[PDB]
Write a protein that binds this ligand. Structure first.
Ligand code: BCL
Ligand code: BCL
Ligand code: BCL
Ligand code: BCL
Ligand SMILES: CC[C@H]1c2cc3[nH]c4c(c3C)C(=O)[C@H](C(=O)OC)c4c3nc(cc4[nH]c(cc(n2)[C@@H]1C)c(C(C)=O)c4C)[C@@H](C)[C@@H]3CCC(=O)OC/C=C(\C)CCC[C@@H](C)CCC[C@@H](C)CCCC(C)C
Ligand SMILES: CC[C@H]1c2cc3[nH]c4c(c3C)C(=O)[C@H](C(=O)OC)c4c3nc(cc4[nH]c(cc(n2)[C@@H]1C)c(C(C)=O)c4C)[C@@H](C)[C@@H]3CCC(=O)OC/C=C(\C)CCC[C@@H](C)CCC[C@H](C)CCCC(C)C
Ligand SMILES: COC1=C(OC)C(=O)C(C/C=C(\C)CC/C=C(\C)CC/C=C(\C)CC/C=C(\C)CC/C=C(\C)CC/C=C(\C)CC/C=C(\C)CC/C=C(\C)CC/C=C(\C)CCC=C(C)C)=C(C)C1=O
Ligand SMILES: COC1=C(OC)C(=O)C(C/C=C(\C)CC/C=C(\C)CC/C=C(\C)CC/C=C(\C)CC/C=C(\C)CC/C=C(\C)CC/C=C(\C)CC/C=C(\C)CC/C=C(\C)CCC=C(C)C)=C(C)C1=O
Ligand SMILES: COC(C)(C)C(=O)C/C=C(\C)CC/C=C(\C)CC/C=C(\C)CCCC/C(C)=C/CC[C@H](C)CC/C=C(\C)CCC=C(C)C
Ligand SMILES: CCCCCCCCCCCC[N+](C)(C)[O-]
Ligand SMILES: CCCCCCCCCCCC[N+](C)(C)[O-]
Ligand SMILES: CCCCCCCCCCCC[N+](C)(C)[O-]
Ligand SMILES: [Fe+2]
Lengths: 281, 240, 302
């Protein structure tokens, strides 16, 4: 089935690979070569996870967990029953994700729109790769990556965090949080603005984008504008994720001590390092 | 206890919310149709929402959604397979017929108005006080297409008064007539403006406007759709 | 080549815009400030005017008082010495009164009183600002969406330093005014309660915080992707759908099987964000009052 205005857009062309071979739809889903690739990497990946469930001796969703090779195996291969499966599922995950991005690229071409969406998705892929590929390699062992399990992956977060004391003190982590909080502030403000203009006081007529600028200038003395806010939202989001990846890649590599201690540098600065009183003297 | 009660209540509230949100997002494009235009058998678990009416500003009227959906224009396309789910090939010239990435929507043939009722977009030469305040001024630069041939020169910039933003460049072709080009599809450079979406021989095909001082919502779609369509359709002429 | 529309190529300027009048009392609207060419590259270059009525002045004054009250305390701790102030800036802290004082207002100035004074100012500063977001919308005749969504943020804040410390019986349960100390308080809060990782509301709150970044990345990128067809003019696309709105919906339907409408997407938005602090507030509120150990609770669900 198609939306009332969809037919005129369903023309051929825009594919990156295979020409007209996979240029078709299944319901609302577009396929394309990368649509098949995604499906392939995905199916093979779930099978390995089911096979893993048997070997683990459980079928419960909250219990299934696929752990990476133990630190001992280094950056080498491990037996399926302990790390091997994780390694292959990771390859499958990477394959699925990259195929998804390219599928989006083909959909962009056919619709004649910019490539901003796939570009934004790639930051997500980057962050994932940072945790299961880049950090582990730099630390010399797959064992530092997180396990594929609903609850088990949460243990990993806590244990990795507390290994450096209170992870709050990670400077990059502080920056990443600020963007995550601000982005939510902006998402709330944007949704509220457009809606307040489209659904005015009962009985009144639709407000204009001018009313929107005025509202924000009356409230805080400035309005970034309708184009600016979408540029801002995209930016706050990618920054939150960029700094998140950064905050973890520096951890256990260039800095492996307690994060709180890192701040001593500021306190130890010559000109004030030796002055009685306060908190640090 | 209270906690288990709260989380249980919350999950019910959430299901109701997702339901409410999906139905609200079905106010356009639905009911679903078959490729021939007749209503499709399977519409989904979500019922069409109860109509809402928008009171348009400036006495422009009213809009009620969901409502009777129709393209209000012919579509020059033909099927390429005996079963649904396959692409529909353009029967003529996709750029001229306005299909595929060259598609336009039959929006009202009136210009968008600002909060005060005046035209939102105007050529800079009619917008008293407006001037280029930063960056390279395009007025005067020749326009080059993806085939490396010059197709004309910029004779003005059409600005959005309310949001002080450049939206279109007015280009003059060899014949002395002008055409509008979307700002977001041109690269202003030190010695020229480059248009990758189109080749020189295609600039004359851009849809012309009625009045020399205003663009209507309908003409904006026809121009933007046409220039966007060049990326795919003017591709064989893109030697770079 | 390939213009991304992240930054403007050329800037245009005209007479300062004083805005729409409607029922706004123009006597309180200040004059227009300077035009920022820097800001103009990303969004609008105009600064001001700003409306500043009675409620605004009150808010703006209480806010400075709150900020200043914490300021002189930091100074007192710094031994008044500017070098120490800048050195230990992050370590200073204005703590709540000791547990012994309970909910009393009779605590020594140097051991809790100043915190109660600072909190009072913040309380007034925030609530007067909320009332302000509701009135600026009314004077222009638009819906109250911004005021209701703001209320969602006020909820978590109200719970952390007012509702919860009250139900618990002492001001000591509140958050201290200090940069490093409030981070410590957060860590301490989790541990004292059996690890917040087991609080289902904390888990939901996180899903939404992550969801908000996902959604704005999707929304923003979508709009810039269709800005070439006038996509940012969201209000008019709602009133008269253009190809921008169609292509945006179609990209999504072809990718994941379903889509939104120009107006509809802003509904997903306001809710995705608002739920972050709504669920969060409930999760914090129950901690210590009803559930004193989330791990234990999660075991028997009693
Ligand atoms: C949420 C659960 C915890 C908590 C956990 C954390 C954690 C964990 C972190 C913070 C961090 C921050 N917290 Mg906290 N925080 C809580 C409650 C609060 C409350 C409150 C009233 O309840 C406040 C005011 C703060 C305030 C702050 C900031 C100091 C900082 C960044 C916030 C932000 O991004 O806003 C975004 C919104 C804005 C409007 C921006 C405000 C102005 C910014 C901060 C500075 C000016 C920038 C300027 C405009 C542009 C640049 C100018 C040039 C520099 C000249 N927290 C509770 C107790 N908070 C992060 C930090 O870095 O701490 C040191 C951090 O890692
Ligand atoms: C006890 C825990 C520690 C701690 C330990 C850590 C550790 C350790 C880590 C973080 C990380 C993060 N921390 Mg911390 N952190 C703490 C307390 C906090 C507090 C707080 C208020 O106290 C906050 C707000 C944060 C916030 C954050 C973020 C900056 C960041 C998570 C976002 C992210 O990385 O996205 C990144 C996004 C992704 C990886 C998503 C990728 C998605 C992929 C590409 C696609 C999925 C497809 C598919 C499977 C989906 C389903 C398909 C079906 C068909 C539907 N931390 C304390 C101190 N923090 C993490 C981080 O920064 O990672 C880099 C991290 O590793
Ligand atoms: C070691 C730390 C503990 C932990 C302890 C806590 C505690 C404690 C809390 C959170 C809370 C939250 N945690 Mg946690 N959390 C941990 C690990 C994580 C992880 C992680 C990756 O594992 C993540 C991603 C998070 C993420 C989050 C957020 C979902 C949530 C905060 C929402 C928010 O927007 O507050 C930011 C927004 C506000 C506080 C609203 C502010 C509104 C007011 C009105 C603003 C006034 C501003 C004005 C005064 C001007 C300011 C001027 C300044 C000078 C700048 N936590 C571990 C288990 N977390 C909060 C929660 O809601 O729990 C359910 C909370 O209280
Ligand atoms: C991001 C930084 C840390 C981390 C820290 C945390 C913390 C802290 C928490 C979560 C939580 C979640 N995490 Mg995690 N998580 C990480 C990396 C991942 C990855 C990954 C591929 O990188 C995935 C798929 C997940 C997935 C999940 C979900 C089970 C859950 C809700 C996510 C959400 O709402 O996002 C927003 C996204 C959307 C709304 C889009 C829809 C996404 C859906 C819901 C994903 C379903 C995944 C599915 C169950 C399993 C994979 C697919 C199957 C094989 C078919 N996490 C890294 C290690 N994660 C929360 C939880 O409740 O866990 C128990 C929580 O408290
Ligand atoms: C749903 C929850 C999310 C959210 C939403 C939200 N917040 C909101 C809103 C909404 C919907 C508003 O409408 C309201 C707003 O007004 O936005 C513009 C607001 C707001 N959220 C704010 C902050 C904020 N929200 C936060 C979080 C969140 N808000 C969540 C992400 C946080 C976090 C993450 O902890 C912060 C820090 C404010 C910008 C604003 C509330 C304004 C307010 O109440 O101020 C009261 C008055 C004062 C403090 C006095 C100010 C005096 C000025 C002179 C200060 C100027 C700045 C100062 C740094 C200058 C110093 C001197 C310089 C020379 C350096
Ligand atoms: C800019 C970064 C932010 C962002 C943006 C973003 N995400 C995106 C996009 C964008 C712009 C898309 O276009 C794309 C999308 O299509 O959304 C509908 C997407 C997307 N973001 C998603 C999830 C997601 N994004 C996340 C985060 C973020 N995304 C950031 C906040 C998270 C977080 C917060 O944790 C998650 C869980 C997906 C819904 C979607 C991508 C879907 C996809 O890639 O499909 C291909 C793969 C499959 C259908 C399944 C593969 C199955 C197996 C091969 C492996 C399964 C196991 C797995 C590896 C581990 C599971 C372990 C967990 C249980 C712990
Ligand atoms: C203004 O404009 C806009 C729109 O519209 C005009 C939009 O719609 C949207 C999009 C936004 C929404 C619809 C709002 C709701 C969205 C979210 C809360 C984001 C979270 C999304 C999901 C949970 C859905 C995720 C689903 C996925 C990735 C696929 C689901 C698929 C299956 C179950 C089937 C399996 C499919 C496979 C393996 C691949 C495809 C298959 C082939 C055969 C090829 C945006 C951003 C927008 O800004
Ligand atoms: C409608 O809504 C509104 C808001 O919000 C919703 C607003 O906020 C504001 C006001 C806000 C602003 C003027 C700022 C807006 C921008 C941001 C919050 C993001 C700023 C950040 C970036 C663009 C990314 C680049 C990063 C920067 C500038 C920070 C870099 C880091 C530091 C300064 C920390 C110290 C670093 C050191 C010592 C190392 C430096 C070296 C390397 C990194 C290498 C307004 C008016 C508003 O109207
Ligand atoms: C340069 O030096 C001078 C002096 C000029 C300065 O200007 C310096 C100023 C500073 C150094 C200021 C520094 C400011 C900070 C570091 C502030 C940090 C604040 C936090 C991170 C706070 C975190 C969380 C706070 C919370 C959750 C507060 C909650 C408040 C309440 C809900 C209010 C509750 C009200 C109460 C208890 C009183 C009720 C009273 C009644 C009468 C009803
Ligand atoms: C976070 C995801 C929330 C649920 C999203 C999916 C809801 C069902 C969507 C059905 C769309 C149906 N269709 C194609 C017939 O219109
Ligand atoms: C403390 C709970 C706060 C909930 C905020 C919910 C905001 C919803 C905004 C849309 C509904 C608006 N309306 C018409 C009622 O004003
Ligand atoms: C409107 C979008 C709704 C998205 C909902 C996403 C929920 C993710 C799963 C959360 C699981 C939570 N938990 C552990 C508290 O039960
Ligand atoms: Fe928007």
């Amino acid at each position: 089935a198609l939306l009332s205005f969809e037919r005129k857009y369903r023309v051929p062309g825009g594919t990156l690979v295979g020409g007209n071979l996979f240029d078709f739809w299944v319901g609302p889903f577009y396929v394309g070569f990368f649509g098949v690739a995604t499906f392939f990497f995905a199916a093979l990946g779930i099978i390995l996870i089911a096979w893993s469930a048997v070997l683990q001796g459980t079928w419960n969703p909250q219990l299934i967990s696929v752990y990476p090779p133990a630190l001992e195996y280094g950056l080498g291969g491990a037996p399926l029953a302990k790390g091997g499966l994780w390694q292959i599922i990771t390859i499958c995950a990477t394959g699925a994700f990259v195929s998804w991005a390219l599928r989006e690229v083909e959909i962009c071409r056919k619709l004649g729109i910019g490539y901003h969406i796939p570009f934004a998705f790639a930051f997500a892929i980057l962050a994932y790769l940072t945790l299961v590929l880049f950090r582990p390699v730099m630390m010399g062992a797959w064992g530092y990556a997180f396990p594929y399990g609903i609850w088990t992956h949460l243990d990993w977060v806590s244990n990795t965090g507390y290994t450096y004391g209170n992870f709050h003190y990670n400077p990059a982590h502080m920056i990443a949080i600020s963007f995550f909080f601000t982005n939510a502030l902006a998402l709330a403000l944007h949704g509220a603005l457009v809606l307040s203009a489209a659904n005015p006081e009962k009985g009144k007529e639709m407000r204009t984008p001018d009313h929107e600028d005025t509202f924000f200038r009356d409230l805080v003395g400035y309005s970034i504008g309708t184009l600016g806010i979408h540029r801002l939202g995209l930016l706050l989001s990618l920054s939150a994720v960029f700094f998140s990846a950064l905050c973890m890649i520096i951890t256990g590599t260039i800095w492996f001590d307690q994060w709180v201690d890192w701040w001593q540098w500021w306190v130890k600065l010559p000109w004030w390092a030796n002055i009685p009183g306060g908190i640090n003297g | 206890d209270l906690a288990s009660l709260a989380i249980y209540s919350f999950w019910i509230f959430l299901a109701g919310l997702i339901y409410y949100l999906q139905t609200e997002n079905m106010r356009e494009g639905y009911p679903l149709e078959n490729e021939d235009g007749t209503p499709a058998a399977n519409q989904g678990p979500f019922p069409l929402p109860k109509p809402k009416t928008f009171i348009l500003p400036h006495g422009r009227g009213t809009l009620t959604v969901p409502g009777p959906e129709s393209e209000d224009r012919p579509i020059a396309l033909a099927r390429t397979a005996v079963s649904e789910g396959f692409p529909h090939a353009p029967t003529g010239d996709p750029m001229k017929d306005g299909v595929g990435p060259a598609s336009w929507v039959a929006r009202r043939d009136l210009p968008e108005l600002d909060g005060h009722g005046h035209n939102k977009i105007k050529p800079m030469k009619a917008a008293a006080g407006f001037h280029v305040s930063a960056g390279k001024n395009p007025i005067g630069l020749p326009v080059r297409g993806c085939d490396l041939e010059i197709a004309g020169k910029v004779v003005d910039i059409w600005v959005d008064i309310p949001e002080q933003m450049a939206r279109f460049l007015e280009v003059e072709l060899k014949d002395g007539s002008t055409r509008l080009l979307p700002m977001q599809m041109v690269k202003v450079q030190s010695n020229r403006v480059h248009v990758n979406a189109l080749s020189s021989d295609l600039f004359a095909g851009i849809p012309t406007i009625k009045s020399p001082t205003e663009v209507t919502l309908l003409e904006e779609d026809k121009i933007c759709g046409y220039v966007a369509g060049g990326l795919m359709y003017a591709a064989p002429k893109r030697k770079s | 080549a390939e213009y991304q529309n992240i930054f403007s190529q050329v800037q245009v300027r005209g007479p300062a815009d004083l805005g729409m009048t409607e029922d706004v009392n123009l006597a309180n609207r200040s004059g227009v400030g300077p035009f920022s060419t820097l800001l103009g590259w990303f969004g609008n270059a105009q600064l001001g005017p700003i409306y500043l009525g009675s409620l605004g002045v009150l808010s703006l004054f209480s806010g400075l008082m709150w900020f200043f009250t914490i300021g002189i305390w930091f100074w007192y701790q710094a031994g008044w010495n500017p070098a120490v102030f800048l050195r230990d800036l992050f370590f200073f802290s204005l703590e709540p009164p000791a547990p012994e004082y309970g909910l009393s207002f009779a605590a020594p100035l140097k051991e809790g009183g100043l915190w109660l004074i600072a909190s009072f100012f913040m309380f007034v500063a925030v609530w007067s600002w909320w009332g302000r977001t509701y009135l600026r919308a009314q004077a222009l005749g638009m819906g109250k969406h911004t005021a209701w969504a703001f209320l969602s943020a006020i909820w978590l804040w109200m719970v952390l330093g007012f509702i919860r410390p009250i139900l618990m019986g002492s001001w000591s349960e509140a958050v201290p005014f200090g940069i490093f100390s409030h981070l410590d308080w957060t860590n301490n809060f989790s541990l004292v309660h059996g690890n917040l990782r087991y609080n289902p509301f904390h888990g939901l709150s996180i899903a939404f915080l992550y969801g908000s970044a996902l959604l704005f990345a999707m929304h923003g990128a979508t709009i810039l992707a269709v800005s070439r067809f006038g996509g940012e003019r969201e209000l008019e696309q709602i009133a008269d759908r253009g190809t921008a709105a169609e292509r945006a919906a179609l990209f999504w339907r072809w990718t994941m099987g379903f889509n939104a409408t120009m107006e509809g997407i802003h509904r997903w938005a306001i809710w995705m964000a608002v739920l972050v602090t709504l669920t969060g507030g409930i999760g914090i509120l129950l901690s210590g009052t009803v559930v004193d150990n989330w791990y234990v609770w999660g075991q028997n669900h009693g």
